[PDB]
Design a binder for this molecule. Structure first.
Ligand SMILES: Cc1cc2nc3c(=O)[nH]c(=O)nc-3n(C[C@H](O)[C@H](O)[C@H](O)COP(=O)(O)O)c2cc1C
Ligand SMILES: C[As](C)(=O)[O-]
Ligand SMILES: [Zn+2]
Ligand SMILES: [Zn+2]
Ligand SMILES: [Zn+2]
Ligand SMILES: [Zn+2]
Length: 117
């Protein structure tokens, strides 16, 4: 399965290189042709980065799940970008992880995508 992602300070980018899966960085022209999983980071107060919101307005029909990178020091706003995406588009939250993730976060993501695919 194809993974689409965005990263501002490189933590999500580090995570997706640990997956060894087909992966594409989001941009303004990208149209995705097949089922995909989104990995986003989380902006202040539980939000979705604008570039990701823009991409999803165009690409949500093929979206099959979302994961968020965040930080537990945000409390119940931890990874809430995934909550908002999941609620809006009616897709599962694959996983939440902190920062660039642990090895267990990597393996869990892959097991959950295998289940959804
Ligand atoms: C200004 C700022 C606000 C953030 N707000 C949240 C938040 O509301 N919830 C959360 O879980 N993480 C939050 N984070 C943490 C980031 O989502 C986290 O560092 C993430 O790994 C960044 O991914 P990136 O390095 O790929 O850009 C915030 C980080 C910054 C610098
Ligand atoms: C070409 As890539 C996997 O660093 O987005
Ligand atoms: Zn690379
Ligand atoms: Zn916009
Ligand atoms: Zn917009
Ligand atoms: Zn709260």
């Amino acid at each position: 399965m194809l993974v689409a992602y965005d990263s501002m300070t490189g933590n999500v980018k580090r995570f997706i290189h640990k997956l060894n899966m087909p992966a594409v960085q989001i941009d303004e022209d990208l149209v995705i042709d097949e089922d995909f999983i989104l990995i986003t980071y989380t902006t202040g107060f539980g939000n979705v980065p604008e570039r990701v919101l823009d991409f999803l307005e165009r690409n949500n029909e093929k979206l099959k799940g979302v994961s968020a990178s965040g930080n537990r020091n945000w409390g119940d706003m931890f990874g809430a970008s995934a909550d908002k995406i999941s609620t809006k588009y009616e897709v599962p939250i694959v996983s939440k992880f902190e920062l660039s993730g642990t090895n267990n976060d990597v393996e869990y993501f892959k097991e959950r995508v295998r289940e959804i695919a």
